[PDB]
Amino acid sequence: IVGGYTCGANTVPYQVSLNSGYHFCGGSLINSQWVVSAAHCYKSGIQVRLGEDNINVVEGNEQFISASKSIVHPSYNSNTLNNDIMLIKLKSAASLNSRVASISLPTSCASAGTQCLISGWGNTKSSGTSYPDVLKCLKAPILSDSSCKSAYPGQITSNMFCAGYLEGGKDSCQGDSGGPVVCSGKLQGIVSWGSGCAQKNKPGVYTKVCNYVSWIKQTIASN
Numbered sequence: 001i002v003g004g005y006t007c008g009a010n011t012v013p014y015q016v017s018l019n020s021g022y023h024f025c026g027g028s029l030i031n032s033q034w035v036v037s038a039a040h041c042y043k044s045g046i047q048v049r050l051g052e053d054n055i056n057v058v059e060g061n062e063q064f065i066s067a068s069k070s071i072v073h074p075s076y077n078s079n080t081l082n083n084d085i086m087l088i089k090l091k092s093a094a095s096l097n098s099r100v101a102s103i104s105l106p107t108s109c110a111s112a113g114t115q116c117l118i119s120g121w122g123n124t125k126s127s128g129t130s131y132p133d134v135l136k137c138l139k140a141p142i143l144s145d146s147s148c149k150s151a152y153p154g155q156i157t158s159n160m161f162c163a164g165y166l167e168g169g170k171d172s173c174q175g176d177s178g179g180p181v182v183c184s185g186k187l188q189g190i191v192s193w194g195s196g197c198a199q200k201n202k203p204g205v206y207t208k209v210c211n212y213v214s215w216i217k218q219t220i221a222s223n
């Protein structure tokens with residue numbers, strides 16, 4: 001997260017870290033058994049880390065649970081990142097508490113201008129590299145579809161939206177991928193891609209979760 005702030009420990013209790021020997025992506029807990037992330041975060045051997053604040057220090061509220069299965073969206077296109085969404089099932093159910101909690105799925109899509117909370121452990125610099133140990137947060141509005149498509153002509157599908165600031169300076173970045181965009185208490189986005197981070201006229205692009213609710217619910221119910 002570039003241009004954000006330190007969230008505070010366990011203030012985003014649905015945020016998870018995906019770990020394969022190291023943190024590599026975020027995700028969101030949607031029930032005690034299932035996490036949503038980005039398809040481009042797929043790999044085998046994922047351990048889901050819940051209850052984290054400093055990802056390099058055991059602070060006492062963590063749960064570390066191996067994934068038993070991962071399900072990439074059937075229409076995911078790795079060349080264009082269309083349908084950049086996957087589901088991860090936990091080998092054992094998370095123990096839900098105030099610091100490990102699920103986030104509700106949308107009942108409809110969110111409007112442009114709605115303010116959202118984006119979070120992650122990704123890079124905090126817009127040129128160069130610095131990774132935080134603690135979770136970072138950014139408040140940012142959903143941008144109009146026209147401003148999104150203007151910024152990325154030929155690359156935005158109906159399964160993507162932009163959020164952030166056309167002036168630059170505040171954005172998600174490498175290492176935030178797969179993590180949440182929450183608006184009005186619902187998981188509306190997944191950190192997906194962008195041209196650099198926090199650059200002018202290049203807002204972050206997010207997977208449009210509201211298009212996938214039926215797929216999520218049916219997939220979970222059958223797996």
Ligand SMILES: NC(=O)c1cccc(N)c1
Pocket residue numbers: 171172173174175176177191192193194195196197203204205
């Ligand atoms: N360009 C990047 O490193 C990146 C990755 C994920 C999200 C965003 N906004 C940017």
Ligand SMILES: [Ca+2]
Pocket residue numbers: 052053054055056057058059062
């Ligand atoms: Ca920790």
